[PDB]
Each structure stands twice: as structure tokens, then as C-alpha cells.
Design a protein around this ligand. Structure first.
Ligand code: ZN
Length: 63
């Protein structure tokens, strides 16, 4: 693995963690995602799976 610096300039995708994209779309919660992650919800409803279906947290979080 390469030493991936946490340098996140110009937001971060609320799924795939990439800070670089052509268009910043919004997911089901309205969070700032990359174009590729936003389209996957238009196709299905869930975003592009990386770290498994773990943090679909439902603990009354309004935001
Ligand atoms: Zn993304």
C-alpha cells in the first residue's frame, strides 16, 4: 500500500472519499458525492460499496 495522505482539498465524496471529480452531485441524504457515486443511487438507491454495508447507521440521526 502507498502512504495515502489525508490531504482533502475541495470537499470529499461522501462514499468513495475522492476529492477530485468533474461534477459534485448529491446522494439520498443530500451529502456532497462525486458524479459516479450520485448516479449509482439514481440507478439503485444505495451508493458505490467500499467498506461493506456497515455504517448505514439508523440511530435517530436527523443529519
Ligand atoms: Zn464518489
Amino acid at each position: 500500500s502507498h502512504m495515502s495522505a489525508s490531504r482533502r482539498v475541495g470537499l470529499s465524496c461522501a462514499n468513495c472519499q475522492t476529492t477530485t471529480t468533474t461534477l459534485w452531485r448529491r446522494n439520498a441524504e443530500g451529502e456532497p458525492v462525486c458524479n459516479a457515486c450520485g448516479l449509482y443511487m439514481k440507478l439503485h438507491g444505495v451508493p458505490r460499496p467500499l467498506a461493506m454495508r456497515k455504517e448505514g447507521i439508523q440511530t435517530r440521526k436527523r443529519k
